[PDB]
Write an enzyme that holds these catalytic residues in place. Structure first.
Site, mmCIF file in Angstrom:
data_model
loop_
_atom_site.group_PDB
_atom_site.id
_atom_site.type_symbol
_atom_site.label_atom_id
_atom_site.label_comp_id
_atom_site.label_asym_id
_atom_site.label_seq_id
_atom_site.Cartn_x
_atom_site.Cartn_y
_atom_site.Cartn_z
ATOM 1 N N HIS A 79 -24.633 15.621 17.276
ATOM 2 C CA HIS A 79 -26.034 15.227 17.328
ATOM 3 C C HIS A 79 -26.777 15.854 18.498
ATOM 4 O O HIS A 79 -28.003 15.989 18.434
ATOM 5 C CB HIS A 79 -26.146 13.703 17.380
ATOM 6 C CG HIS A 79 -25.650 13.025 16.141
ATOM 7 N ND1 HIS A 79 -26.316 13.101 14.936
ATOM 8 C CD2 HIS A 79 -24.549 12.272 15.915
ATOM 9 C CE1 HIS A 79 -25.647 12.419 14.023
ATOM 10 N NE2 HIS A 79 -24.572 11.904 14.591
ATOM 11 N N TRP A 130 -29.328 6.882 17.983
ATOM 12 C CA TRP A 130 -28.474 7.302 16.878
ATOM 13 C C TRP A 130 -27.251 6.406 16.739
ATOM 14 O O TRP A 130 -26.685 6.301 15.644
ATOM 15 C CB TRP A 130 -28.057 8.761 17.053
ATOM 16 C CG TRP A 130 -28.701 9.660 16.049
ATOM 17 C CD1 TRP A 130 -29.809 10.434 16.231
ATOM 18 C CD2 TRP A 130 -28.289 9.859 14.691
ATOM 19 N NE1 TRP A 130 -30.106 11.113 15.074
ATOM 20 C CE2 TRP A 130 -29.188 10.777 14.113
ATOM 21 C CE3 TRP A 130 -27.244 9.355 13.912
ATOM 22 C CZ2 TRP A 130 -29.074 11.199 12.792
ATOM 23 C CZ3 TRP A 130 -27.133 9.777 12.601
ATOM 24 C CH2 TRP A 130 -28.040 10.691 12.054
ATOM 25 N N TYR A 150 -33.478 25.095 0.527
ATOM 26 C CA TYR A 150 -33.924 24.029 1.417
ATOM 27 C C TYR A 150 -33.381 24.216 2.828
ATOM 28 O O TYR A 150 -34.137 24.165 3.806
ATOM 29 C CB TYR A 150 -33.517 22.656 0.881
ATOM 30 C CG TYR A 150 -33.879 21.562 1.858
ATOM 31 C CD1 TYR A 150 -35.191 21.128 1.979
ATOM 32 C CD2 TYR A 150 -32.920 20.992 2.688
ATOM 33 C CE1 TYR A 150 -35.541 20.147 2.883
ATOM 34 C CE2 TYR A 150 -33.261 20.007 3.597
ATOM 35 C CZ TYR A 150 -34.575 19.591 3.691
ATOM 36 O OH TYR A 150 -34.930 18.611 4.591
ATOM 37 N N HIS A 159 -22.264 12.698 3.817
ATOM 38 C CA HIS A 159 -23.053 12.404 5.009
ATOM 39 C C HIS A 159 -22.558 11.152 5.719
ATOM 40 O O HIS A 159 -22.760 11.009 6.931
ATOM 41 C CB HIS A 159 -24.529 12.258 4.646
ATOM 42 C CG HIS A 159 -25.253 13.563 4.546
ATOM 43 N ND1 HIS A 159 -26.457 13.698 3.887
ATOM 44 C CD2 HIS A 159 -24.948 14.791 5.028
ATOM 45 C CE1 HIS A 159 -26.858 14.954 3.962
ATOM 46 N NE2 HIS A 159 -25.962 15.637 4.652
ATOM 47 N N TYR A 191 -21.458 21.566 6.631
ATOM 48 C CA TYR A 191 -22.509 22.552 6.835
ATOM 49 C C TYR A 191 -21.940 23.893 7.286
ATOM 50 O O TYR A 191 -22.634 24.685 7.928
ATOM 51 C CB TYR A 191 -23.539 22.034 7.838
ATOM 52 C CG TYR A 191 -24.400 20.922 7.281
ATOM 53 C CD1 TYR A 191 -23.928 19.620 7.218
ATOM 54 C CD2 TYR A 191 -25.680 21.179 6.807
ATOM 55 C CE1 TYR A 191 -24.709 18.601 6.701
ATOM 56 C CE2 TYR A 191 -26.467 20.170 6.288
ATOM 57 C CZ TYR A 191 -25.978 18.883 6.239
ATOM 58 O OH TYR A 191 -26.761 17.875 5.723
HETATM 59 O O1 LIG Z 1 -29.276 15.287 5.687
HETATM 60 C C1 LIG Z 1 -30.113 16.094 6.132
HETATM 61 C C2 LIG Z 1 -30.509 16.287 7.470
HETATM 62 C C3 LIG Z 1 -29.974 15.681 8.633
HETATM 63 C C4 LIG Z 1 -30.485 15.989 9.892
HETATM 64 C C5 LIG Z 1 -30.044 15.459 11.179
HETATM 65 C C6 LIG Z 1 -30.995 15.402 12.207
HETATM 66 C C7 LIG Z 1 -30.688 14.915 13.469
HETATM 67 C C8 LIG Z 1 -29.391 14.456 13.741
HETATM 68 O O2 LIG Z 1 -29.074 13.974 14.979
HETATM 69 C C9 LIG Z 1 -28.426 14.503 12.731
HETATM 70 C C10 LIG Z 1 -28.759 14.994 11.472
HETATM 71 C C11 LIG Z 1 -31.508 16.906 9.855
HETATM 72 C C12 LIG Z 1 -32.107 17.564 8.789
HETATM 73 C C13 LIG Z 1 -33.200 18.480 9.204
HETATM 74 C C14 LIG Z 1 -34.621 17.994 9.207
HETATM 75 C C15 LIG Z 1 -35.390 18.117 8.052
HETATM 76 C C16 LIG Z 1 -36.711 17.675 8.018
HETATM 77 C C17 LIG Z 1 -37.288 17.098 9.145
HETATM 78 C C18 LIG Z 1 -36.535 16.964 10.303
HETATM 79 C C19 LIG Z 1 -35.213 17.408 10.337
HETATM 80 C C20 LIG Z 1 -31.580 17.230 7.545
HETATM 81 C C21 LIG Z 1 -31.908 17.679 6.148
HETATM 82 C C22 LIG Z 1 -30.848 17.057 5.168
HETATM 83 C C23 LIG Z 1 -29.946 18.133 4.539
HETATM 84 O O3 LIG Z 1 -29.271 18.891 5.493
HETATM 85 C C24 LIG Z 1 -31.482 16.398 3.882
HETATM 86 C C25 LIG Z 1 -30.630 15.562 2.916
HETATM 87 C C26 LIG Z 1 -30.446 14.193 3.139
HETATM 88 C C27 LIG Z 1 -29.682 13.394 2.293
HETATM 89 C C28 LIG Z 1 -29.073 13.954 1.168
HETATM 90 O O4 LIG Z 1 -28.326 13.170 0.332
HETATM 91 C C29 LIG Z 1 -29.239 15.315 0.909
HETATM 92 C C30 LIG Z 1 -30.008 16.094 1.776
#
Ligand SMILES: O=C1c2cc(-c3ccc(O)cc3)cc(Cc3ccccc3)c2C[C@]1(CO)Cc1ccc(O)cc1
Length: 192
Positions: free
Chosen positions: A19, A89, A135, A172, A187
């Site tokens: 994170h 978090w 995306y 996730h 990832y």
């Molecule tokens: O999960 C996701 C994520 C996470 C994180 C983040 C952030 C901080 C942290 O400290 C740990 C994790 C960040 C992002 C990036 C982001 C996108 C839009 C606005 C701000 C940030 C994502 C996208 C994404 C895919 O990567 C969308 C998604 C969820 C759920 C699902 O079922 C499928 C896709």
């Protein structure tokens, strides 16, 4: 057999580093602080100006992202530094694990459902590999196609084969919340 992991691991340095990497990725202006305004702007900017989301889709997606980062203690007009970020978090992961155990829709699932309705051109909650590349590169969380392909290797893809929110919520759970070893490389090499 082990279906998952409902225990937190906040003292794990690789969870903090995971994170912290995300924090530095979100702090594009190197302020040491980020706000809910910036996160929701980034989120809506991607789906509207890159993925062609309809106003109805963007509204649902906006409320989901807002609730997600809001669950980590981020608020509009408030700048969140790293100590307040990682502490929030811990609260986000704790509240999500409570929703996981209660079989209650989690914040990460609600975001996935709203996002996948946009990313899936068929709007059936299942995205292809190209759409996942579209995306993650637009968001920047993944830069190379090689790391995007690792996601479809880690995930239990269906016969299409596409990725749905059920499987991504399962991955996730262990990647963001509990440090499940089976969810490593979700990832690729983009996120430690
Ligand atoms: O999960 C996701 C994520 C996470 C994180 C983040 C952030 C901080 C942290 O400290 C740990 C994790 C960040 C992002 C990036 C982001 C996108 C839009 C606005 C701000 C940030 C994502 C996208 C994404 C895919 O990567 C969308 C998604 C969820 C759920 C699902 O079922 C499928 C896709």
């Amino acid at each position: 057999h082990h279906h998952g992991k409902l225990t937190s691991d906040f003292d794990n340095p690789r969870w903090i580093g995971r994170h912290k990497h995300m924090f530095n990725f979100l702090d594009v202006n190197h302020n040491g602080k980020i706000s809910l305004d910036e996160m929701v702007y980034k989120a809506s900017d991607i789906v509207i100006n890159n993925l062609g989301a309809t106003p109805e889709q963007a509204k649902r997606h906006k409320d989901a992202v807002e609730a997600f980062f809001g669950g980590a203690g981020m608020k509009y007009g408030v700048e969140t530094d790293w100590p307040a970020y990682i502490e929030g978090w811990k609260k986000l992961a704790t509240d999500e694990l409570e929703k996981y155990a209660k079989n209650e829709p989690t914040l990460i699932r609600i975001w996935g459902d709203a996002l996948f309705d946009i990313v899936d051109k068929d709007q059936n909650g299942a995205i292809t590999l190209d759409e996942w590349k579209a995306y993650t590169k637009a968001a920047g969380i993944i830069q190379s196609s090689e790391d995007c392909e690792e996601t479809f290797r880690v995930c239990d893809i269906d016969e299409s084969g596409q990725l749905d929110v059920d499987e991504m919520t399962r991955q996730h759970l262990g990647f963001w919340y509990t440090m499940d070893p089976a969810c490593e490389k979700l990832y690729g090499g983009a996120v430690p």
